[PDB]
Design a protein around this ligand. Sequence first.
Ligand SMILES: *[C@@H]1O[C@H](CO)[C@@H](O)[C@H](O)[C@H]1NC(C)=O
Ligand SMILES: *[C@@H]1O[C@H](CO)[C@@H](O)[C@H](O)[C@H]1NC(C)=O
Ligand SMILES: *[C@@H]1O[C@H](CO)[C@@H](O)[C@H](O)[C@H]1NC(C)=O
Ligand SMILES: *[C@@H]1O[C@H](CO)[C@@H](O)[C@H](O)[C@H]1NC(C)=O
Ligand SMILES: *[C@@H]1O[C@H](CO)[C@@H](O)[C@H](O)[C@H]1NC(C)=O
Ligand SMILES: CCCCCCCCC
Ligand SMILES: CCCCCCCC
Ligand SMILES: CCCCCC
Ligand SMILES: CCCCCC
Ligand SMILES: CCCCCC
Ligand SMILES: CCCCCC
Ligand SMILES: CCCCCC
Ligand SMILES: CCCCCC
Ligand SMILES: CCCCCC
Ligand SMILES: CCCCCC
Ligand SMILES: CCCCCC
Ligand SMILES: CCCCC
Lengths: 337, 338, 335, 340, 332
Amino acid sequence: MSPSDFLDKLMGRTSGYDARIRPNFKGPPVNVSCNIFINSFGSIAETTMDYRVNIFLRQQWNDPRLAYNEYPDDSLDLDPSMLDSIWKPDLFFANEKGAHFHEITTDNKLLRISRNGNVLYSIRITLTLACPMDLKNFPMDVQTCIMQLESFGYTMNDLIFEWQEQGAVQVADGLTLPQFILKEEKDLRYCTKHYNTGKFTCIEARFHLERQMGYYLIQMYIPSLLIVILSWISFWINMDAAPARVGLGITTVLTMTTQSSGSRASLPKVSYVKAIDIWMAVCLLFVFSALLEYAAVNFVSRQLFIQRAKKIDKISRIGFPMAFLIFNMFYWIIYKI
Amino acid sequence: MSPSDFLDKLMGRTSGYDARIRPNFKGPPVNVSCNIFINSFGSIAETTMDYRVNIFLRQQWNDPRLAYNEYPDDSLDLDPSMLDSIWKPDLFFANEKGAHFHEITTDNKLLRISRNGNVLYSIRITLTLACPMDLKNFPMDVQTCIMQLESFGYTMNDLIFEWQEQGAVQVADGLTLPQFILKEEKDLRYCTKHYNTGKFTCIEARFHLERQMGYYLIQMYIPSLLIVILSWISFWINMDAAPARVGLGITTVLTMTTQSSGSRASLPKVSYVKAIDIWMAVCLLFVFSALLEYAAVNFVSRRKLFIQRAKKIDKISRIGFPMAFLIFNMFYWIIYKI
Amino acid sequence: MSPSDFLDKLMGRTSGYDARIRPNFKGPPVNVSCNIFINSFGSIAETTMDYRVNIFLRQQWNDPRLAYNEYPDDSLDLDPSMLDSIWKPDLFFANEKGAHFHEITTDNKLLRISRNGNVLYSIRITLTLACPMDLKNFPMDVQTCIMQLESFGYTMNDLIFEWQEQGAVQVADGLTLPQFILKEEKDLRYCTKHYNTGKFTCIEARFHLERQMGYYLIQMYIPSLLIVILSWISFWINMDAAPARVGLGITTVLTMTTQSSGSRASLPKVSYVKAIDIWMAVCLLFVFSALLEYAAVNFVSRFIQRAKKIDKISRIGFPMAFLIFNMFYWIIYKI
Amino acid sequence: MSPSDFLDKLMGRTSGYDARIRPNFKGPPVNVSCNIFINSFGSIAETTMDYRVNIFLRQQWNDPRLAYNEYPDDSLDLDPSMLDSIWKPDLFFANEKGAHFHEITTDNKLLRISRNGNVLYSIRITLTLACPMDLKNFPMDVQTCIMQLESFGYTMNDLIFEWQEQGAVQVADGLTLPQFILKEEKDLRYCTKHYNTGKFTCIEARFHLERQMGYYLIQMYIPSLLIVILSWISFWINMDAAPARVGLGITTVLTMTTQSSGSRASLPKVSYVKAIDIWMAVCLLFVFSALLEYAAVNFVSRQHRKLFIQRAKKIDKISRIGFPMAFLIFNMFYWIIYKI
Amino acid sequence: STSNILNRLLVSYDPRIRPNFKGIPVDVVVNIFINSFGSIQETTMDYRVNIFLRQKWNDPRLKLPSDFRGSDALTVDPTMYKCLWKPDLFFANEKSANFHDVTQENILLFIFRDGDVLVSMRLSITLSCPLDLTLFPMDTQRCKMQLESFGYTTDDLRFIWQSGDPVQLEKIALPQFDIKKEDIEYGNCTKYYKGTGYYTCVEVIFTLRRQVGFYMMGVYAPTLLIVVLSWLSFWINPDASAARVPLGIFSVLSLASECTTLAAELPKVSYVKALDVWLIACLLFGFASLVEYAVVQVMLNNTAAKRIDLYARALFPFCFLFFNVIYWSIYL
Ligand SMILES: *[C@@H]1O[C@H](CO)[C@@H](O)[C@H](O)[C@H]1NC(C)=O
Ligand SMILES: *[C@@H]1O[C@H](CO)[C@@H](O)[C@H](O)[C@H]1NC(C)=O
Ligand SMILES: *[C@@H]1O[C@H](CO)[C@@H](O)[C@H](O)[C@H]1NC(C)=O
Ligand SMILES: *[C@@H]1O[C@H](CO)[C@@H](O)[C@H](O)[C@H]1NC(C)=O
Ligand SMILES: *[C@@H]1O[C@H](CO)[C@@H](O)[C@H](O)[C@H]1NC(C)=O
Ligand SMILES: CCCCCCCCC
Ligand SMILES: CCCCCCCC
Ligand SMILES: CCCCCC
Ligand SMILES: CCCCCC
Ligand SMILES: CCCCCC
Ligand SMILES: CCCCCC
Ligand SMILES: CCCCCC
Ligand SMILES: CCCCCC
Ligand SMILES: CCCCCC
Ligand SMILES: CCCCCC
Ligand SMILES: CCCCCC
Ligand SMILES: CCCCC
């Protein structure tokens, strides 16, 4: 009748139940269905190939040794201090890279006991998972950051995890992402892998992340074509201000070089060619061609000749914008596969 | 008579009191009114979408098992050593992004006991709250940062949270913030929500916080003003000094590009348009147009009748552009100051 | 005779001395004497608006339950491992922003017992105090940071703190501070404040801090003077070819802009106008007036005697104004 | 028949097994075979002479006191809560520079018992080991960092470590590194050293790592060739208005110096010359030679007919025909020499 | 069993009391290993060291009886080490430090016949040492590591440097500096704290003389390049003014910007530095080039300024040569 006596006789010293032995010992495996609840995404980075999530984690299984028939009510809750006195799964995260509990005024742990013997256990933890970030089409990128969940000290012939089909990965509404939005649909498959000591149950939930074009698009695309049209208006200058034209052209080259250097320094070093880097390269090539053909037309003007130089200048003036526009159209169509 | 004996008979071994059972078990829910005392803000940064606070925290409730009638005085102070021997709530912060206690020379926790059984429990903790910042009119930003205070393992039928409305958010007197001053108003409502495990109580407070433009005024707008005045002095020069005037033009463009790049560094990468950026970009377009019109007038200059027309056009530009910049400045400021 | 038996009969299980009760219960408060001793400052940074110190911490009081008259020696030490066996105060720090202990090879904690009943208890602690930093006259600044030592879980009528008079805040001899030297004079005053739950004892220890001009002086003022004399030599050029003078002026205004941008990277963002920033603004205005003057004289040229006359008048009058403003500013921010 | 009682009678209180006693005391040493399993490299940056790794760690040895003959089955596992209750080795990493455990929802440690008496104990831990970076041929770098494994509280006369001959250093499949790559061959030798207090067993495992050229190749070598071609077109520019070519050369020098400064910062402070600072310095001296050649031709032009102007044009075309060949052959030597 | 001897040794043994409490102060010796002397950071005024601390002291209560074996040495585990008594020891100039528990706490126990015992706890350290940042490129820094007790006094406990290895590892391979001599002077730093009395000390310094390579190759060559561009400016026709002035003002801008950037890297010291004065001399030389060209133009406009220009371009280079010669000679 006494709740403290009831708790002690259910688990503890005066119970005959040992927390150090897995349920149904020398028998069928233990399922332990688990579902996760996102509570705050974000703080994602790229220089370190990781993202940080503060999530819940709720496990569901049935322990016959914990069956009770005293309290008429079905649902029942327990002080989290009781948790260490009963058996627990050894769930851990494969791509872990640092995680910890939260001890603010209490170890934030929930324990619920069903009448039959089913048990629900939850815990709030914060993780920093490692994601194989791929940056081929960096401005127009789509990524699959994953979390691998598996047991460590139990062979899968004794323990195998599942997910409750009714929204196992339910996600809070108010959460939002800087330079990102996650998609509603979330895949769910298995990752059961083997090691030299056997094979362990592995489960995983993969997320799809989409980065908005806006920030990168505006803040670094716009100066590119801005300086491109600066070169365009530089063509309209005549031959007399040759030092002025060459100085402005080389300074535009400086602007492209420094903007490209900043763009590269923002993003971590990668061997495979990125996407926007071809944009900086092509703008640098266009400004270089502008300066080169201005120098060439000056040389041919010094070396009839004036009319031909003017004709090639107007041909360049009518051609370079057309080539730039067709290149932009080609780029945008080719990076929307 | 002995205080140690009284403590032992009240809680501990020879008391029959178990800290793992909530008061009024299997009955009415418990009332837990709590107040938050602010002690220091600071280190609020937009780079990581958060702010750090160091606050006190006091809960209030009355466990009937704790009632006593031995010591005549109503008040009764206790060593926080006994704290682990009594029942506690499971209070925690939803958006807290890691936090800790202060273990300096002791565990700085105060427990107070009233004659009727009312108990006061206080603990000093330091948090790093995640604030969903918005940066639309960021130069004149006004903010609403919250702290979702909620229980974890107790539903509606078991535990409730309220506020001591008399100074619930009692704040320290002399505190202040860099680039920030907070208003005396503190809104107060409930975040009450549900999960698949049930529903849990909320109480929370939101602090209206705004950033004063002072530093941002000096560092951001003044250099742009200087560069654009340089653009008008570029207008003021004649046409035969083509290398000089155009070099001034591109060099002002360099100042503009470097300034625009520098301002972007502090803020996080956000897709939606900011408020400083439009200022920088539009007066960048002003200096760009300055260079464009100088190039155009040079082209017009290159039998002699159109020279007077070119000079007249230069005068018209040199007159209109200051007026256009001033009217635009007034228009932009009146939009973003309202 | 037996040390173990003596310790057991003094405190612990077979002593009746409970560590959960403060001395002289239901009686007069404990006066308590507490003093600190610095070991090292360091890391004075305005970016985070705080600083870290490494100090000791000593308390003094008398516990009647700890009275003993067996060992002839007055002074008596004890093993730090049995610190928790006896009562201790709850001396914490108001604004502290996170600390720790030193656990190297032992908890570096010292406990001493006096014959009459006085007890000495010292722990080496490393703090990180938040300081209400001010930057009005930044290069010539004088700073005063504080540590609010006080109790937490004991009311003022139950517990008070006090300082031992002779050298309460004695400091190490050879320590030095980058960008700073503290003065030997340190004040001492009470800070007994109130809360809705009651009121508590509170003590203060404030340090006067002065920052040397040297680093900022050289690395900021010298380049500014170099750019001003660049502007002077720009004046000295003939009017003839515009590009040389105009480009020199442009280079100087770029130097001003770059130095203004780089100056404030270390300093924290503050709304109120600083002291160095007004110098940057005024030298930028000097070079701006130089370039505007050259634009005006170019307009006048395209009267040559008037142009050269006004050029000479500017070249002679500008240095006088610069010198008088320089002296005015330095006396204003030095007195 | 109670499963818990077998654990107590095998080890613990009601067993007589003193965990403070190593197996086979006052006798032959213990072989203790061990093998590791990498899970994820990463955060290997030269700025701190170190890299972070996440590996498993398993020990194999035979304990006669742990030998048992009551369970019919061969294999036997145990709850990780009793790991401290039995004796364990004192394996530690000599170079450590920060290490810890994983304490998420449990202490993720595994122990297994063999029927004969041999034991299996595994643990996953995270390391940040010092890697003695050598930056001689930095763009074409080859580098090995050794993971020192040894005992501390047992002399090698009583404790020995050895590797499983069959795949002791078996590695995961899907792992990859940012602009690095680890080769399949991985040496495995001994490191048993001495001290003033004695000598201890010490096993060694070393890796061979390469860095893909691509990133550094493009990001730094492209501007060099760009400035070379820009100096070439500066040569192609005629000599009537000095400030044009003067400013072009000045801007090229600015590009070289700023790019060299930017390359400097990421790489850590070192005394001996690197492999790409030599590239940067030689490109800087080519652009300096370009500006000096322009200064020389300007001096020849204005020293004062056109006979010496003809010689100035001749030296201009000589430079135009020589610098390309010299630059190409120098690049051939440069690239060939550091690839051998 | 074999643990009976140690269990009997520990029973009726009080770790709360140091050996010979009423006797003479206990005698301690130290052998500080140096395993991984980490990189030093000037901006933090700190450096990291990884040591294998070793201590020995007589303990009559820890006398191993000859009844079992009379072993020359005996070994037990860290749990027994925690059970036994230990000498407290805190590092004076320590500011952040911890232990190592990669598998368990690293402690070794050797128990001798006499009663002397040996312990060793590896423990990573980050120290503090006030850098004499003056003469920065040519400096020999003295960062000191000292030990002293806290709870016990000199009349109760004392430290002595054992006549043994203070330096240990030969393959240190420090990134920047290098260590040749490790002499112990001011070894005893017996310290007094008011109201506590005498505390025994043992102290050792590490003498680290910085090399020159990085700074010699990273800054000095750019300075020389800027100076030779200025010399070429001296070798330009004074008639032109849209080229000579712009390149010179660019050179002085670049030199000043490099000066500011390099000065921002070191900790903000409050006195002059060698690199500072080098950059200052270079900057005033550039400004001298600009002002002499301006003077030449002024004289040319309404004697000839060409002779002055050639005299300057012939004389000042030698001035720079022997000035930097004097600089290097005086700083070496
Ligand atoms: C786990 O659930 C699956 C459902 O198909 C089934 O194998 C069985 O019910 C459970 N396994 C156990 C209890 O070992
Ligand atoms: C306080 O009293 C009871 C406690 O269970 C609760 O039902 C009630 O709603 C609480 N609030 C009041 C009375 O305002
Ligand atoms: C201690 O109590 C108060 C508080 O400091 C003080 O005035 C008094 O003199 C002291 N002694 C006694 C016996 O109260
Ligand atoms: C392995 O252990 C056995 C028994 O302890 C010993 O005889 C043998 O020498 C050991 N092997 C090695 C290589 O040390
Ligand atoms: C320190 O003093 C002790 C005795 O007082 C002596 O044995 C030891 O050699 C001294 N060490 C040094 C470095 O002077
Ligand atoms: C990932 C390879 C992209 C190649 C793009 C080529 C575009 C040519 C116009
Ligand atoms: C006492 C030193 C004053 C500053 C000297 C600066 C020399 C460039
Ligand atoms: C969505 C991108 C559109 C670009 C048009 C030029
Ligand atoms: C309070 C806003 C002031 C703005 C001044 C330009
Ligand atoms: C609010 C700042 C004003 C500064 C004027 C120089
Ligand atoms: C220390 C500053 C001196 C200034 C003299 C004008
Ligand atoms: C000319 C500067 C004088 C300063 C006196 C404090
Ligand atoms: C603080 C005084 C400023 C004076 C500016 C002329
Ligand atoms: C792979 C060999 C390349 C040689 C280039 C000159
Ligand atoms: C693989 C080396 C390529 C070099 C091209 C210039
Ligand atoms: C040892 C210094 C070498 C410098 C090469 C440019
Ligand atoms: C591998 C980078 C692209 C070269 C043209």
